[PDB]
Structure 1
Amino acid sequence: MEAAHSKSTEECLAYFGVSETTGLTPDQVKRHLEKYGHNELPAEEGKSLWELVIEQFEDLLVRILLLAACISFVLAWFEEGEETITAFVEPFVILLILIANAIVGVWQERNAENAIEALKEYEPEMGKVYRADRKSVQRIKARDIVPGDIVEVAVGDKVPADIRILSIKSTTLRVDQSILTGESVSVIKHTEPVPDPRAVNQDKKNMLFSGTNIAAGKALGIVATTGVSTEIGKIRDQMAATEQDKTPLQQKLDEFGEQLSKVISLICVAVWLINIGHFNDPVHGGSWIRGAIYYFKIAVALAVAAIPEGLPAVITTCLALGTRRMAKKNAIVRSLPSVETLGCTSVICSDKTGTLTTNQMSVCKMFIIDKVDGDFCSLNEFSITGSTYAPEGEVLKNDKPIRSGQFDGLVELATICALCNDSSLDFNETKGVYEKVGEATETALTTLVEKMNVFNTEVRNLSKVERANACNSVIRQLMKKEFTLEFSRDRKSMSVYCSPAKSSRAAVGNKMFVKGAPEGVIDRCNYVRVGTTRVPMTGPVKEKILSVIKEWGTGRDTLRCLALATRDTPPKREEMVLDDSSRFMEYETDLTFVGVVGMLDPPRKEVMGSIQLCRDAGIRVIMITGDNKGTAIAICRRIGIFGENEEVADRAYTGREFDDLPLAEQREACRRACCFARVEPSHKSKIVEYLQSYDEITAMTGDGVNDAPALKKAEIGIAMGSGTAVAKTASEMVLADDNFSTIVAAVEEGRAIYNNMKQFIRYLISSNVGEVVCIFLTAALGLPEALIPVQLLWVNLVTDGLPATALGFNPPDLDIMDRPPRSPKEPLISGWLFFRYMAIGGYVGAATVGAAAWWFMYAEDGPGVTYHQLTHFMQCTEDHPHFEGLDCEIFEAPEPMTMALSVLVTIEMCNALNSLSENQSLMRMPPWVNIWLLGSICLSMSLHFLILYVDPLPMIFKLKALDLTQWLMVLKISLPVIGLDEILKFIARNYLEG
């Protein structure tokens, strides 16, 4: 690793003193071991999440509760033993709950690391290295690279470590970058320097890393690095040995968690500390040590209520049962905790040629020179009938279907596209896929001549395999190809040499068909192919070629234009010396320029629909591409990635521009930025960091054996279907098909997931404040019962799980997409929503001042008594030395404790209107929306009978009162005060309707 890309290739030879000639000798091998290492690469290291992020804060309350329970038992058993009855069995039931906490805990960890799960392995086959340590072409194996291996990347060499190109033993070189970038495109690197000091991998466009050499390019490259030192290794393991990030909904878990824990830990301790007086007094005190431990357990019950353990297991359950009915798009669901987390997606940064450009590269347009007189040209311009790898659908004459063989120029044109085409299309029926065999450029040509069907062959009548190459090889069966000299960067053309078969016309009547990059062809093309005829290169003809390159090339319509020229006067294998670049170049004149074909990386497709919602309504799609700025501009406008014919400069920033400007302006590319041109993993990470500092939290695409800080540190790894194992093993949302719906159903179904987590987390935070305030009543005042430790846990058992899933979840709420644009800046805890939370908190607070404390009077439906005066003075009742302690303890009696428990259960359950819809209250009551609440009510009902009547529970808790109206003090607050939240939804800009 060195500036290398920037520097002379000739210097790069000297950098290790190596060549095909003077090869890597044994002490050069040694010399390099003695510097760089030898591809020591860490594996997987799927680190966990749950306990660390949640339990290990409140552990010192919730888990040590077990120890405190044991100590209270140990005390009592030495003092009044069995006699402690309720609070004797209470430590055992606390133990039972702690066992259940541990079970729920281990389930949650074995999902949290199971999100990460079995990340990374499988390097594909390395390369043929020339060496001198054995001067033999060693098909090297991953570890035994010793920087300076002279790798012939060529036939199926998955380029091993950090390489820089030295020399090519062919005129083409195409190195696929799927396995390096995500972007599944066989890029043109180049032998010579890329002068700019940019350290990133696209800007290193002569440095090679894990790229697929697609055989078209018998190259030779120097291994510039090996080991952790290697860019590939470094960029793997700095993410994928310890992966995690904000995984979008988790960032909104922060909002609650980060504050809550610290507050809860503190207030639990405060409840204990204030009690210094009130631990001494009678039914808990006397032996005030009991009192202290009692209040500790009460304060820990407060912690349980405020940080519910069930909650994340519940999301995992909602997730499981949700996702299997959501996801009508590409979503190979790699792991459960990827999805109900993914559903607050804010940016989908997809690599270009997968989905956003369907990796189905066919020719979309062409023009031939039709006929020319008085220099004015009939250019027989055309679009091609129908996108995709469909060899059906011929050619449109402006733009209506025509069998292409009806036009004279299209004969020799088709002969170019079939012959000057050494790659292919196959229809591997076995896999059901039209495989783009070899270079996508020539696959496009294959599909083109199949569509064209110049020789009117039956085609769809041979097997659909043969139908990918039939018309093609009919042409080849006439004009027998008899060598090819492939596309060089320099001459900007390739020469296929072909004459008839059967008719012995080789050498003599042997034509040459040339294909290459625009200008380099259009100037050597000294003749215009006037369809059949030939004239010189005439003016207005060349003028309209020179419009087309900018027309269908810088307009919204932009083709990847490829110029095609026939040679008429039959060249000679006898004059064709078959070696140098320029030799070929000068043979390539007498060129009757036929026209330009254009492969616009699929037309329609479809990729535009999503992008509206992915510009405004929420989830911004970015194109990641190896395309340069100018091309990417138009290439994006073509598919609505920048929507209309609006201005640019900004909308497609290059990874170069991005990196030229220091980190502030680099950041100030990222917000709502529509495309990032010339980008790879090294840029993808930076894009995420900047997106996160706008809250445009990510889902980033890649596949490659160094896409790791774009798989994670990127919220969700979107695996390209394409190259490497590590996509499909380590990225959570695997793509398979090219459908654009994948994007749309984030702004649809992903926002449903967001609403799931909303109503779910809402319920607990609004209801279970009742449990929270119960602790305040029982602990601060003289036992005016609400919820003794075990009694608390029953309300928990009612309110966690079942109501959260009941609202959640399923069709969550009304207005699924139709809900306001989820503009990445909305909190979870929206101001007026927090006001609602506090209002419901006020309600459950007042209802717990009810509990038994108020409720022993007014309309009790049981204890026809009162002394609700006394409650005010703290030191109420509690066994004899207390204010008015003639009685033992009126709240300790059967009906009040059990009923206080029961009233909290019911009053918290009333929140299942306020948290049911977010705000569309009345209209989200009809049972075709999520009404699992029926099951929640069934829980409360069955548990009511159980807790009251079935005596084993009355031992631990207290005994039955009667199923009745009950609590007409407190219950008759609930429904009116819920109606007050209706009024609160109408406060300000006061409409009064709902």
Structure 2
Amino acid sequence: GRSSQKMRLDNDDLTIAISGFITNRIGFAIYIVLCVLTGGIAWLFLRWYPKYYVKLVGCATPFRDCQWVVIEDHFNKMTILSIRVKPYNRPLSTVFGPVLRELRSITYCYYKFYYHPVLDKFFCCNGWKDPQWNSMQNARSGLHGDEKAHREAVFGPNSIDVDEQSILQLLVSEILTPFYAFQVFSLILWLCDEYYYYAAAILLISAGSIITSLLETKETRRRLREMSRFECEVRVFRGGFWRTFPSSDLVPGDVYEVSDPSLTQIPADSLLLTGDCIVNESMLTGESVAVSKTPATNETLAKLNPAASTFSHDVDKHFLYCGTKLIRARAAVALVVRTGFNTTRGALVRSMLVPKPSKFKFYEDSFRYLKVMGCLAGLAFIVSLVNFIRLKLHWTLILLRALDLLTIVVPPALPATLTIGTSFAVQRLKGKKIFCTSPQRVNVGGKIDLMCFDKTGTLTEEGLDVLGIRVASRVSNRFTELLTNVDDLTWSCDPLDPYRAALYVMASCHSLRIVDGVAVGDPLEVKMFEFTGWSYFIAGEVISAPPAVGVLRAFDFNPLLRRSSVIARVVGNSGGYALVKGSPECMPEICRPETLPSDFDELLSYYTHAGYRVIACATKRIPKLNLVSVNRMTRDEVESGLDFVGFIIFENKLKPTTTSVIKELLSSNIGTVMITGDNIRTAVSVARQCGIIEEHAHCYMPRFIEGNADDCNAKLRWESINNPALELDPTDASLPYDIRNYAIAVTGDVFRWIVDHAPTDVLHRMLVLGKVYARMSPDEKQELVKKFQSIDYSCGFCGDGANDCAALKAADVGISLSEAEASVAAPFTSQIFDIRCVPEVIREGRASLVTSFSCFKYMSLYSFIQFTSVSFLYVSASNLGDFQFLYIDLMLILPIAVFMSWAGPHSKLCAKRPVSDLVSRKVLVPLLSHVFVCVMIQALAWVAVRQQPWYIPPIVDTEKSNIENSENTTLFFASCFEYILSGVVLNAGRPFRQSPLETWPFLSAVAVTLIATLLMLLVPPYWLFEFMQLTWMSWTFKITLIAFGFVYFLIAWTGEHYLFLWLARFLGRMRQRLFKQPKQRKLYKIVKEKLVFENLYF
């Protein structure tokens, strides 16, 4: 009996291990008695480290006989789940692809593993081919009665119902982290030591942080549950009749109806059987164009695969996805295939909740630093305890002092201070209309090294504009200039006149209807009508000699003929006219070949290759027509024998301010790529116009030369687009084949083949070189972003559709551009709809990163200075007073820390990135030198004060510490002079922020604190003298204290700018030259260097 298994859930990530255990009933008693005895510490310690809990309670057993299982993933986060068993009696094949009895299963992250007995394993994905699907006769007659019920036990309900959790569960999963336990212990220590005010302050700030984080999490999870909760009402063929049911009672096999008008959205992944349908797949592709779907023939059942997760075109022509609108339908039924989380939209939603560890190592490294500091504080506690039992002091004093020395070294207000930079950045972003939801992501904005991009909604207007109109004259059968405008059309001549005929076509060849003074109807007609500027069974001309027209009848656009016609009669002419507009491919089989110019085919190829959509117009004259002829003669006589007029052209025109933002991003050493769902010819042209691809480079793309994507052993040919002769060395490395710049533009079908059957090195080179990525579903967007991240990139995204959701959530920083169905996952949410909020986010990220690092260094220095002062004082059982602590802790550190995080970022993207890690050498090395300088200054001040003739030595006191010394006061003033100047020196400045001379609050706060301290030193009033427990000093010694404080500033400044970085580089070079361990480099750098050098080699 097997009792372990390993699986890979996601596309490539999520390696998990499942094991099965049993409760000992003795370890459980030990655990409960231990919890009772310790009052609650065992519960905490066995919730933080469940490995020992399992080792204490669990006893290993095989899978067949089990009661709960443990699932451990690649990030080492264990979990306890309970196996569920249900009575069930059908053949094994009903559940997979014998007899099955128990039907054991486990649910993990909405995946549902089932237990195969004879193979003795857990299986996640098996499509349930349900072999009845052989003929339309079988598939049309749906399942009857009881057969549904058993299905309900295997597939569950058809509802994407994520599980919400209560407030108390959030609290027990949030507060119980170890740091808050440490904070509670510190608070107990303060209140037991009569040190109230500071404890109350940090309690208030901790409570505020908890409240804001809790509200954040609750709002996020509430919002995510509204994008994935759909409820409709359909009619199903359960028992030979049509019965009305909710959308939740559907199981694979039920045949429902799609022709009814109540049904406005597809309930589940379906397949047509009769009739026809019209849907717009705005959720799978970014476009909003109407798509027509036709019934599935008897052959296509064979190739259907309910688990392929991406369907070929042969079967995609008949598949009705779930969650897509329904424009129009004909007696048409449909057969469901997948329900629940197996649906493409359901699978996307499920993959939006799977956990993924972060590559930003800031907060975790800070916590590791505090843990090392605690390891030091333990030794300090031991030494203090020995030195205190030496002096024969009382026991309460020894305990209290030795324990407060713990909270001195591990400051309980470091994490609550490390968020001020992001807290201040959020409102600047909100002022510039960008709305952030996860503040922890702001720092990540400073690490962006790549920036992906949508096309249709982001880099381009949503609709299709009108570029120009071309016409061929009958004087010479050749085309003319571009004729962008309509005024030129009105004032041009050679329905006999060509230009006026084309204007007539653009004016009255539609079926638009007027609502609210504007026009509605087919999306393409609207743009033409607006371009004309005219008005609308006759079309009224604009006031600003063009005659009006009067329509007698019209044949709308025919799905099979692919054209439309309008028979009208201008008032002037006794005879009528017929205008026909349609696609240029089937046009030649209607019009006269004499009317077709010599430029037809090559000009059509030129326009189509650049990516436009072309439509052609034609005219005809009917010498005699009346009210009886139109009803007597059909469209066949209308169409045949027309006169070619001209081409009208559409264009996906890009937003006015994109070619500048992309140029700036390229000039700031940030690469950019396009990841779109549209064609592979429009995408390349828009990338040429925008600036992603340089104006002179080539664009090689892959083609299938031997076999389609099915065969596991196929060959690829990397051809060129403009010149189909040049190729790339395929087996071989992607290099130009027997020149300076080029860019592979991979389609969306060959990319899957590359990821599957191609070596890793070719994949890496394609990732480094590829600029354009078209014809991709959301899943390929997401896993392409993950592939980018897996070679040490840090990539963002930008999009404005539910198409993009997964790529927005899986990217390091994802900026949305809308407010519906796409801002649920994206951290940020712009509202100006242009790509101008990307530089904003990057700038604020860099400023926030440098600010956070500066604050961390400042708080660490504060901790060390206080520890050194207290360690000097403890050598004689003395201590700082209970109010000097308050002054230092509350009126010097918190105000300077808050105001050090106030200045804004620069007004321009620079060309260099900030340090983005804590355990580095260039961060640690300049910190320990500052610590050394601080300690040296304090030691010098102490030695200096111990030699004056009015010195008042400390007194050892058994009941309480003595505060009125001449050795406490000197260290107090040295510390006060050091805190302010350390805050001034460690400030972030010119490169990624505003220089401190242009920001007033910081300088004002430093000045007021320094003047307060200097006045408290030089001439203090008596109440301060008897209130802070000071002692007399000669006026010649205060000047010496000021001198030490001053010279510390010079030493710290010179070290921080000049010497400390030099020492860091010196130590780094010595380590490299002595320890002979290679320096790791980011992969894409290595691949780029290999590529350029080897290309130069040829």
- TM-score normalised by the shorter chain: which range applies? 0.7 to 0.9
Structure 2 counterpart of 1:232: 345
Q: Does 1:458 find its partner at 2:542?
A: yes
Structure 2 counterpart of 1:858: 944
Note if contact 2:393-2:957 (Cα within 8 Å) is conserved in structure 1: no
How far 1:598 sits from its partner (Å)? 2.0
Note if contact 1:245-1:715 (Cα within 8 Å) is conserved in structure 2: no
Q: Does 1:646 find its partner at 2:697?
A: yes
User: Cα distance 1:334–1:842, how it changes in 2: closer, same or farther (>3 A)?
Assistant: closer
Given the two structures, how large is their TM-score scaled by the length of structure 2? 0.66
Equivalent position to 1:38, from 149, 157, 170? 157
Give the SS at the match of 2:674.
strand
Query: Partners in 2 of 1:982 and 1:666 — Cα distance?
Result: 44
**Paired amino acid for 1:359:** E
Note if contact 1:807-1:932 (Cα within 8 Å) is conserved in structure 2: yes
How far 1:114 sits from its partner (Å)? 6.2
Q: Deviations 1:440-498 (Å, cap 9, x if unpaired)?
A: 433333334338999893379xxxxxxxxxx9xx97x723553414445xx5x233444
**Paired amino acid for 1:458:** V
Given the two structures, how large is their TM-score scaled by the length of structure 1? 0.72
Matches within 5 A, 1:94-243: 95-110=199-214, 112-113=216-217, 116=220, 118-120=222-224, 121=226, 131-133=236-238, 142-147=247-252, 148-152=254-258, 158-164=264-270, 166=272, 173-177=278-282, 179-180=283-284, 184=288, 186=290, 199-200=309-310, 205-206=316-317, 207-210=319-322, 212-213=324-325, 215=327, 218=330, 221-240=334-353
How far 1:7 sits from its partner (Å)? 15
User: Cα distance 1:718–1:350, how it changes in 2: closer, same or farther (>3 A)?
Assistant: same
Moved more, 352-361 or 610-619: 610-619
Equivalent position to 1:835, from 904, 907, 922? 922
Q: Does 1:499 find its partner at 2:568?
A: yes
Structure 2 counterpart of 1:299: 406
How far 1:601 sits from its partner (Å)? 0.3
**Paired amino acid for 1:450:** G
**Paired amino acid for 1:446:** F
Equivalent position to 2:596, from 515, 526, 537? 537
User: Cα distance 1:267–1:951, how it changes in 2: closer, same or farther (>3 A)?
Assistant: farther
Note if contact 2:461-2:655 (Cα within 8 Å) is conserved in structure 1: no
Note if contact 1:791-1:901 (Cα within 8 Å) is conserved in structure 2: yes
Structure 2 counterpart of 1:89: 194
User: Cα distance 1:36–1:989, how it changes in 2: closer, same or farther (>3 A)?
Assistant: closer
User: Cα distance 1:958–1:667, how it changes in 2: closer, same or farther (>3 A)?
Assistant: farther
Query: Partners in 1 of 2:1032 and 2:218 — Cα distance?
Result: 47
User: Cα distance 1:110–1:131, how it changes in 2: closer, same or farther (>3 A)?
Assistant: closer
Q: Deviations 1:168-217 (Å, cap 9, x if unpaired)?
A: 856x845141x445555555777667979862479784434355446256
Q: Deviations 1:319-344 (Å, cap 9, x if unpaired)?
A: 344224445xxx35557666565565
User: Cα distance 1:898–1:160, how it changes in 2: closer, same or farther (>3 A)?
Assistant: farther
Structure 2 counterpart of 1:581: none
Note if contact 2:799-2:815 (Cα within 8 Å) is conserved in structure 1: yes
Equivalent position to 1:754, from 846, 865, 872? 846
Structure 2 counterpart of 1:774: 866
Equivalent position to 2:933, from 827, 839, 846? 846
Matches within 5 A, 1:858-877: 858=944, 865=951
How far 1:279 sits from its partner (Å)? 0.9
Give the SS at the match of 1:354.
coil
Matches within 5 A, 1:565-580: 565-566=618-619, 576=634
**Paired amino acid for 1:541:** D
Give the SS at the match of 2:387.
coil
Q: Deviations 1:137-157 (Å, cap 9, x if unpaired)?
A: 889754244444445379796
Structure 1 counterpart of 2:458: 355
**Paired amino acid for 2:421:** I
Query: Partners in 2 of 1:896 and 1:954 — Cα distance?
Result: 16
Q: Mind listing any 5+ residue stretches in structure 1 that lack a counterpart? A: 74-87, 386-393, 396-400, 461-470, 529-534, 578-583, 868-876, 882-886
Query: Partners in 2 of 1:930 and 1:944 — Cα distance?
Result: 21
Q: Mind listing any 5+ residue stretches in structure 2 that lack a counterpart? A: 1-94, 98-126, 701-742, 1066-1098
Equivalent position to 2:606, from 526, 551, 555? 551
How far 1:916 sits from its partner (Å)? 3.3
Structure 1 counterpart of 2:834: 739
Structure 2 counterpart of 1:938: 1008
Give the SS at the match of 2:786.
helix
Query: Partners in 2 of 1:282 and 1:985 — Cα distance?
Result: 38
Query: Partners in 2 of 1:925 and 1:383 — Cα distance?
Result: 57
**Paired amino acid for 1:215:** I
Q: Deviations 1:879-914 (Å, cap 9, x if unpaired)?
A: 289xxxxx9988x43565465355434423324444
Structure number with the bigger relative contact order (C-alpha 8 A, sep ≥ 6) is 1
Query: Partners in 1 of 2:641 and 2:264 — Cα distance?
Result: 40
CA RMSD after TM alignment:
5.3
Query: Partners in 2 of 1:258 and 1:29 — Cα distance?
Result: 51
Query: Partners in 1 of 2:408 and 2:523 — Cα distance?
Result: 65
User: Cα distance 1:607–1:101, how it changes in 2: closer, same or farther (>3 A)?
Assistant: closer
User: Cα distance 1:920–1:610, how it changes in 2: closer, same or farther (>3 A)?
Assistant: closer
User: Cα distance 1:681–1:369, how it changes in 2: closer, same or farther (>3 A)?
Assistant: same
**Paired amino acid for 1:590:** G
User: Cα distance 1:50–1:190, how it changes in 2: closer, same or farther (>3 A)?
Assistant: farther
User: Cα distance 1:339–1:598, how it changes in 2: closer, same or farther (>3 A)?
Assistant: farther
How far 1:978 sits from its partner (Å)? 0.5
Query: Partners in 2 of 1:16 and 1:910 — Cα distance?
Result: 87
**Paired amino acid for 1:310:** T
**Paired amino acid for 2:1002:** W
Percent of matched pairs sharing the same residue:
16
Give the SS at the match of 2:821.
helix
User: Cα distance 1:413–1:737, how it changes in 2: closer, same or farther (>3 A)?
Assistant: farther
Note if contact 1:421-1:445 (Cα within 8 Å) is conserved in structure 2: no
How far 1:309 sits from its partner (Å)? 1.9
Query: Partners in 1 of 2:570 and 2:398 — Cα distance?
Result: 104
How far 1:134 sits from its partner (Å)? 8.4
Structure 1 counterpart of 2:23: none
Note if contact 2:813-2:827 (Cα within 8 Å) is conserved in structure 1: yes
Structure 2 counterpart of 1:390: none
Note if contact 1:243-1:713 (Cα within 8 Å) is conserved in structure 2: no
Q: Does 1:511 find its partner at 2:604?
A: no
Give the SS at the match of 1:759.
helix
**Paired amino acid for 2:911:** P
Q: Does 1:562 find its partner at 2:615?
A: yes
Q: Does 1:444 find its partner at 2:521?
A: no
Query: Partners in 2 of 1:123 and 1:30 — Cα distance?
Result: 25
Matches within 5 A, 1:578-597: 590-597=641-648
Equivalent position to 2:384, from 278, 292, 302? 278
**Paired amino acid for 2:978:** I
Structure 1 counterpart of 2:363: 257
Matches within 5 A, 1:862-901: 865=951, 879=956, 892-893=963-964, 896-897=967-968, 900-901=971-972
User: Cα distance 1:265–1:837, how it changes in 2: closer, same or farther (>3 A)?
Assistant: closer
User: Cα distance 1:763–1:31, how it changes in 2: closer, same or farther (>3 A)?
Assistant: closer
How far 1:951 sits from its partner (Å)? 10
**Paired amino acid for 1:380:** T
